[PDB]
Structure 1
Amino acid sequence: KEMPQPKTFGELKNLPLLNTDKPVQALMKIADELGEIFKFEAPGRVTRYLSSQRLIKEACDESRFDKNLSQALKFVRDFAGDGLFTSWTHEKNWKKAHNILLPSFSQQAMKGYHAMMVDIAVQLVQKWERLNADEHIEVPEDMTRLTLDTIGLCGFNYRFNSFYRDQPHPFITSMVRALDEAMNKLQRANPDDPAYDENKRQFQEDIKVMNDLVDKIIADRKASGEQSDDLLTHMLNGKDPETGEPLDDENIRYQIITFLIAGHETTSGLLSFALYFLVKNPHVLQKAAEEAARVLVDPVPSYKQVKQLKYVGMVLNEALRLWPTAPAFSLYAKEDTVLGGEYPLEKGDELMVLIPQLHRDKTIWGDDVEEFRPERFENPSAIPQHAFKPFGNGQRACIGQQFALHEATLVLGMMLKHFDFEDHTNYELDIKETLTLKPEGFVVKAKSKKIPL
């Protein structure tokens, strides 16, 4: 009868368990103890966390369950609007933007963005080439610089020039602070306290900063009418085949903001986690390094060459298995239904999918789920369906998957080609949680292989 449920705090029920700066990791620890499913109650709200493939494969049935906006995404909606990430499936603007943008994010479309991805990738490599002997690299910080600039340059032909700065571009500063505020509202439960009136003031300033800049460029592009290899161009000229309508300027701005929120820290995390696992597993590093040296024979990597980096792609997937940088997504029941032949759900009942736990399901991956072994993904078809979901599910899955994977593969490939890396501090893994996961304080020393660009 009784579904498992963690410890309670009187009238607040389970809510104070999320009063911590590592909620996802705390939920993973509760999942290990309680198993494939547990209930999580707060005042006037309930959800259910899923950890097993057998339940999550049902949850991924699109006729039965549809994407839900978690409380986090709802707060991100205040600045991300009805962009793809924070819109409901049934909103007109989701499907409309989805139909228009899908060709712009396809595997074949990556040939278009490639040149500009290399531009930023080269800047990364050149920064590291120009370091002095005893200097070190702050990994996630530089990965974040690279991903922001790559999406900025590929998305709307704008250069944040993050590698020319210590304090980031105003937009970026406002965005991270807005994200932090959004995530902090999950912990508290006193909206209109006089102290938090300061937080709401900054929030509205940050919203305006992001809106003003993006709206400025949208207008500048329409007035000049120039063509480029970016998403903004496709969003201005694009028509939805279904409704026959283009996106209006307001939605276009929300998509641009969305691409930065959704993509930048997820991708930077992937590279950060990938490099971490590589330096903690030297034999795996040699393999990836060998492939990089063999395949990337030109100083400027080509699109075709990135596709050949098979083992580098396996490394990234295994990093995503262990630490999926967007660790959860939310679903709701479209109608009354039974989950697993023993858990009745009413219409509107919300489900959370703990992706890190899904990826540690003993019944799928084996006994050694904590080990870093890219060999697991030697054959893509071997992996059973709905067992590996770092990019979410179905029509609400990540539209920027091919973008993210092409960027991470290109950059990691170039990193392993040009440098030997050293875990000089014997770094202990400390996972910082915002909307996404990152290895905080992860540092390495890169020794150059003296290969020209």
Structure 2
Amino acid sequence: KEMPQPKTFGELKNLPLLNTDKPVQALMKIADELGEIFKFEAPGRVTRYLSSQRLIKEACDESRFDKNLSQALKFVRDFAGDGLATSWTHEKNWKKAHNILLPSFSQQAMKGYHAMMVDIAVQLVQKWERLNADEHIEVPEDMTRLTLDTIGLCGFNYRFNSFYRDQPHPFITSMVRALDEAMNKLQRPDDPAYDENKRQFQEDIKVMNDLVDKIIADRKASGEQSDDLLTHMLNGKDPETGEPLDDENIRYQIITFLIAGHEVTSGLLSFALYFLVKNPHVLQKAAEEAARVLVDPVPSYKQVKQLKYVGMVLNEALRLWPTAPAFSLYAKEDTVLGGEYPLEKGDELMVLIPQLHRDKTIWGDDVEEFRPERFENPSAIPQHAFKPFGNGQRACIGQQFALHEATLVLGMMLKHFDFEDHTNYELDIKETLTLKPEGFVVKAKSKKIPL
């Protein structure tokens, strides 16, 4: 009945607990001490962090709870606008864009993106083939180069050409810095010293809008059709309203795809490769499948679907380190959570996904072990025990994109190289809007298989 709460800081309540560079990991440690639910207070803010499948399955009841914009999402909305991820469910543009974009993200739609995904994946493999002996790979850096370029190409047929660069494309520099500012504001008491941050934030917003608005304008003037999301958004109409997306919302969707999609996906690939080199038996089983299935120089769409064990590796990586580590909900009406926590209408909840995925009552005692065999039969996973892509109608629209992209790339990586954990890398998880293993490096010895 009485809800636990972590240590407080006088008038600041729990807010200084987030004044740390690893807030998700701090919140996981708090959940370890306090259990399946704890209250978190800040000035003008009250929320409750959920960690058990028992309570989270109730929070995922869409008749009782709807998606809430966390403070992180509210600050990201300053440049993601009313794109899909930072829209409220009741805003006209959410359901409108949802209806228009859902067919463009289906499993069937991945067939049309596959060639562009292979384009960037080949660039990654060729980069690694061209490294000299005893040179090493900066894993999250290269994975981010790949995910950003892949979403740029599939999103609006634009090449950031990240594998030709040390310094990222100016758009990416502003995007990353806009994301940093949004997350930094959370742990912030906005005195005059943050005036430089505010000025830079508006400059980065303009850089992103200008490039995306220019590409939309360029595409409309040309009239060209590609296999990208931009073409689908220029031509698609919402069956409900009968309306197409306007040019401003299309810009916010493109910005959203880059922001919401690139970092979670590169983090997944980096964590998956980390767990593979830390678990050689798993790596051998995954590499066997990649060699058996990927019999052609370029993987086909159908071949990627056959990489079953690679998909199990990826899901187990998402279980331990879900790269989008939380989502937020609010009570649609007064309701009682778990039969003992009464909530009033509007009360907020946070789903702490890494803790959910460590619920021993669901996964057993070996929760911290990396065992892709947990996912050998998907039906053995209880409802709402595994939520790396969120919940319900507000779940990740990019889920099939992310998993096709990650399965393809990890498959090709395992087909073409043996990997050495040459530094015995100590896992260090950097936190931004997402999670990723900072400083993860490996050596790749080519199997000398041509492309």
Shorter chain as normaliser: what TM range? over 0.9
1:412 corresponds to which of 397, 407, 410: 410
For residues 310 and 5 of structure 1, what CA distance do their matches in structure 2 show? 42
Deviation at 1:138, TM superposition (A): 0.1
* Deviations 1:272-314 (CA, angstroms, capped at 9, x unpaired): 0000000000000000000000000000100000000000000
Deviation at 1:397, TM superposition (A): 0.1
For residues 325 and 193 of structure 1, what CA distance do their matches in structure 2 show? 32
For residues 246 and 44 of structure 1, what CA distance do their matches in structure 2 show? 38
Say which SS state the counterpart of residue 167 (structure 2) adopts: coil
For residues 378 and 99 of structure 2, what CA distance do their matches in structure 1 show? 27
2:212 corresponds to which of 207, 211, 214: 214
For residues 360 and 327 of structure 1, what CA distance do their matches in structure 2 show? 13
* Deviations 1:334-354 (CA, angstroms, capped at 9, x unpaired): 000000000000010000000
Deviation at 1:381, TM superposition (A): 1.1
Which aligned segments of 4 or more residues in structure 1 are displaced greater than 6 angstroms? none
For residues 81 and 440 of structure 1, what CA distance do their matches in structure 2 show? 29
For residues 426 and 43 of structure 1, what CA distance do their matches in structure 2 show? 43
* Deviations 1:153-186 (CA, angstroms, capped at 9, x unpaired): 0010000000000000000000000000000001
What is the aligned partner in structure 2 of residue 399 from structure 1?
A: 397
Gapped runs of 5+ residues in structure 1?
none
Deviation at 1:437, TM superposition (A): 0.0
* Deviations 1:39-83 (CA, angstroms, capped at 9, x unpaired): 011122100000000100000000100000000000000000000
What is the aligned partner in structure 1 of residue 79 from structure 2?
A: 79
For residues 190 and 372 of structure 2, what CA distance do their matches in structure 1 show? 49
For residues 10 and 205 of structure 1, what CA distance do their matches in structure 2 show? 36
For residues 10 and 250 of structure 2, what CA distance do their matches in structure 1 show? 46
* Deviations 1:222-270 (CA, angstroms, capped at 9, x unpaired): 0100000000000000000000000000000000000000000000000
* Deviations 1:186-209 (CA, angstroms, capped at 9, x unpaired): 111xx5422110001100000000
Deviation at 1:430, TM superposition (A): 0.3
For residues 258 and 45 of structure 2, what CA distance do their matches in structure 1 show? 30
* Deviations 1:366-395 (CA, angstroms, capped at 9, x unpaired): 000000000000011110110000000000
Deviation at 1:96, TM superposition (A): 0.0
1:379 corresponds to which of 352, 377, 380: 377
Query: TM-score with structure 2 length normalisation?
Result: 1.00
Say which SS state the counterpart of residue 85 (structure 1) adopts: helix
Say which SS state the counterpart of residue 185 (structure 1) adopts: helix
For residues 192 and 359 of structure 2, what CA distance do their matches in structure 1 show? 46
For residues 374 and 241 of structure 2, what CA distance do their matches in structure 1 show? 43
For residues 338 and 206 of structure 1, what CA distance do their matches in structure 2 show? 43
What is the aligned partner in structure 2 of residue 96 from structure 1?
A: 96
For residues 98 and 382 of structure 1, what CA distance do their matches in structure 2 show? 30
For residues 259 and 148 of structure 2, what CA distance do their matches in structure 1 show? 9
* Deviations 1:415-438 (CA, angstroms, capped at 9, x unpaired): 000000000000000000000000
For residues 225 and 44 of structure 2, what CA distance do their matches in structure 1 show? 51
Identity %: 100
Deviation at 1:2, TM superposition (A): 2.1
* Deviations 1:123-174 (CA, angstroms, capped at 9, x unpaired): 0000000000010000000000000000000010000000000000000000
- Between Structure 1 and Structure 2, how many residues are aligned? 451
Deviation at 1:11, TM superposition (A): 1.2
For residues 65 and 97 of structure 1, what CA distance do their matches in structure 2 show? 21
Query: TM-score with structure 1 length normalisation?
Result: 0.99
